[PDB]
């Protein structure tokens with residue numbers, strides 16, 4: 055039809071990639087995944103409650119934090135309910151249902167009304183106590199009033215979805231072989247000899263290696279040689295990768311899955327365009343080929359074809375000594391970055407039913423399996439069929455994440471990690487979502503349980519689905535390595551989210567494309583900002599607003615908010631290397647009880663996915679702290695990669711950098727004075743109440759950021775990259791932008807404000823040291839979780855292209871090993887290194 059061809063053409067523009075494109079493909083896998091995902095998508099669309107889908111309430115089952123409780127004086131919460139123009143402040147209990155709060159409204163003077171948060175497409179509905187709604191919790195934390203507009207449900211017809219579209223391998227004792235025909239590149243000019251190393255890999259584990267003779271590095275090098283491996287064909291596991299690498303030293307690589315998605319041994323002829331190494335990475339593991347056929351290195355190979363095909367079948371007492379049990383338990387209580395030795399692995403494997411009794415043992419036990427041995431692998435599966443302990447176990451997200459990393463390539467190992475994730479409520483899925491999307495890079499096949507968990511969760515909740523879109527779209531628009539997989543996963547989502555989200559995504563995508571042009575132009579007018587730039591900006595925004603540009607769009611980093619018209623007078627270009635656009639918008643919603651403006655920074659030039667990852671991890675730290683009743687007042691500002699080297703960032707209101715506070719100079723030229731931050735703080739606070747409230751928030755936020763940045767290894771920052779709000783909330787910005795050194799930014803200007811300038815102690819600095827220690831020890835209760843996120847982040851987001859060594863930073867900084875008091879002391883040390891010390895690093899940067 056056309057019809058369907060129009061839709062597909064719609065889809066393509068949203069995704070920013072053509073899933074029907076069959077040009078950079080050498081098999082069926084992608085098309086096969088497209089059709090495979092029809093079922094899971096249709097089962098979730100059909101099974102969806104349409105009423106709750108449309109109103110997407112955002113709730114949690116977590117207790118309301120202690121902190122939080124102390125903001126509810128007499129078991130009471132006030133809710134102001136608007137209707138045209140009148141508004142009454144009902145009195146409510148924290149366990150009252152929105153059902154109960156509507157009866158308590160009509161009786162306190164046609165059932166079809168919901169409470170809608172004023173100024174936002176956010177609903178307080180369903181069978182949840184009002185205190186357990188995240189908006190309600192947001193309000194309680196920030197000391198704001200809870201304003202709701204009594205109105206009519208959203209019509210679920212707007213979310214309507216358009217009706218849609220052998221010889222056994224274990225009988226083969228032959229050793230496996232690949233013919234290397236040759237390599238061909240259109241131009242050399244690196245400025246030698248070369249060989250091809252051929253690896254049989256299973257999830258980063260090298261099973262097997264054969265290599266070619268060196269030959270001179272011409273534009274074309276023929277070999278043309280059989281490389282016979284030590285490994286039999288019957289022992290090739292599912293997920294086995296043929297990895298082909300070109301040396302002198304590593305210059306190019308490419309991969310070919312040896313067992314395909316239909317369980318068939320790969321046969322025949324391939325010409326494969328390779329990826330280049332650029333002067334330890336999820337990129338190294340991709341099954342995708344370079345689409346750039348004009349410029350890339352190519353390798354030509356032949357797989358030992360047999361006119362008969364080869365599948366891959368689908369698998370159908372005693373007691374431990376006391377001291378070996380203790381040997382084992384010591385292994386199991388060791389952290390994720392701790393190397394297993396050959397001995398440890400053998401102990402793990404020999405005593406593998408004992409090991410199964412401990413869910414924490416599983417990464418290390420599955421890391422002790424010989425995946426290059428058909429019979430051992432078979433015994434691993436017999437083991438995983440015996441899973442009562444794993445299934446009864448309390449979800450541990452840290453443990454589960456670990457089974458979904460680069461070390462686990464077996465479908466069946468990974469499927470029990472996803473099994474566990476099913477029990478996460480939507481609030482927790484949102485916390486981990488970007489890390490779960492990224493973990494899709496460690497999957498061998500396009501269609502995986504993980505991909506289907508993400509799809510399912512995205513289709514079941516519009517807030518999840520919103521972030522799944524942008525997170526997937528971000529990767530598609532800058533990862534050639536994975537854009538084909540992620541595009542197929544994104545199209546799948548897109549075919550089940552409903553007509554209204556499709557409409558919304560289009561406008562957002564449209565707004566974003568318009569603003570890209572508008573900032574490309576301004577970057578190039580402005581050399582390394584003049585009248586005739588804020589001429590041509592205010593000009594271009596006008597000639598768009600006003601054009602062309604949508605009447606409203608949803609804010610991608612905060613989908614409950616809708617932006618309307620530009621505030622053209624408030625829009626500047628920031629005085630910065632990359633000329634970011636500071637934009638401000640009118641809020642589309644009339645029921646918005648303020649006049650405040652929606653601020654959005656748009657920047658070309660930098661890859662914003664690193665920031666995303668760090669910001670997401672800090673939010674995890676806050677939920678970790680929340681479990682121990684600590685609020686460190688972070689501001690993990692919104693920030694979304696929207697396409698290639700572009701994206702938007704939340705303007706935090708009433709906020710300046712610390713540099714600007716100092717640069718009302720001060721006599722440059724140079725450095726720096728201790729009061730000023732405090733005077734600015736007094737200058738911005740009216741009452742002595744608010745001032746001291748501000749000094750307090752400062753003590754918490756400073757502590758949060760000192761801990762959070764130290765653990766992540768990104769605390770040695772210059773103060774043009776540290777901001778503070780008028781109410782005292784300190785925050786770091788711009789994690790892109792990742793001797794003498796410093797573990798964090800605690801400069802004399804922060805110390806004054808705490809009242810310990812020049813150099814002694816004070817009540818506030820005493821609180822600071824105490825809060826830092828509690829915070830630090832709380833994160834350490836979750837050492838494993840943090841070690842896995844950090845190591846995943848580096849591998850999926852941090853070029854570099856990183857080395858077991860960069861990853862080990864965090865265990866050092868988390869002082870793995872140590873006890874509560876040696877760790878308390880370590881961090882109290884770090885607080886002292888900053889004090890010594892003072893302004894040198896800030897001054898030093900001046901030095902240029």
Ligand SMILES: COc1ccc(-c2cccc(S(=O)(=O)N3CCN(c4nccnc4-c4ccc(OC)cc4)CC3)c2)cc1
Nearest residue numbers: 628630634655657691703704705706709710711774787788
């Ligand atoms: C207003 O609240 C903010 C929220 C987030 C951010 C932000 C977060 C991450 C990155 C960016 S950026 O790349 O657009 N940024 C880079 C650093 N940057 C500066 N560099 C040197 C000196 N000053 C700045 C700067 C100026 C103003 C400012 O906000 C008022 C923030 C930083 C400005 C623009 C900005 C800035 C302000």
